[PDB]
Design a protein around this ligand. Structure first.
Ligand SMILES: *[C@@H]1O[C@H](CO)[C@@H](O[C@@H]2O[C@H](CO)[C@@H](O)[C@H](O)[C@H]2NC(C)=O)[C@H](O)[C@H]1NC(C)=O
Ligand SMILES: *[C@@H]1O[C@H](CO)[C@@H](O)[C@H](O)[C@H]1NC(C)=O
Lengths: 48, 34
């Protein structure tokens, strides 16, 4: 659903979906080729 | 031979970057071929 979100201080508006990206154990969020956030790690479940 | 380098999201119609919209041409490739 289109929601507003705040993940451990990272804020924005968007639709959250299950991701197939595999983050390293320490990484909390990701960015695309133009440095705009496009993925987050849920701080409670660690799902990407 | 000609390829695209548009670093966005592609859908049949990220999808529009951050307020940046790409419009289709009026004449499609088939119409130009015609
Ligand atoms: C604290 O975080 C942990 C994981 O980082 C949560 O543990 C999981 O919670 C889900 C849903 O509550 C359960 O289905 C899992 O089985 C839990 N995992 C384990 C290993 O127990 C935990 O629930 C979080 N606590 C709170 C209060 O949110
Ligand atoms: C629009 O979305 C629906 C979702 O079920 C899909 O079946 C359909 O093909 C989509 N059409 C276009 C033009 O994107």
């Amino acid at each position: 659903k289109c929601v507003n979100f705040n993940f451990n201080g990272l804020t924005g508006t968007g639709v959250l979906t299950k991701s197939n990206k595999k983050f390293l154990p320490f990484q909390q969020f990701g960015r695309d080729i133009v440095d705009t956030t496009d993925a987050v790690r849920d701080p409670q479940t660690l799902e990407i | 031979k000609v390829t695209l380098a548009d670093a966005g999201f592609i859908k049949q119609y990220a999808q529009k970057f951050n307020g940046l919209t790409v419009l289709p041409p009026l004449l499609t490739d088939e119409m130009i071929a015609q």
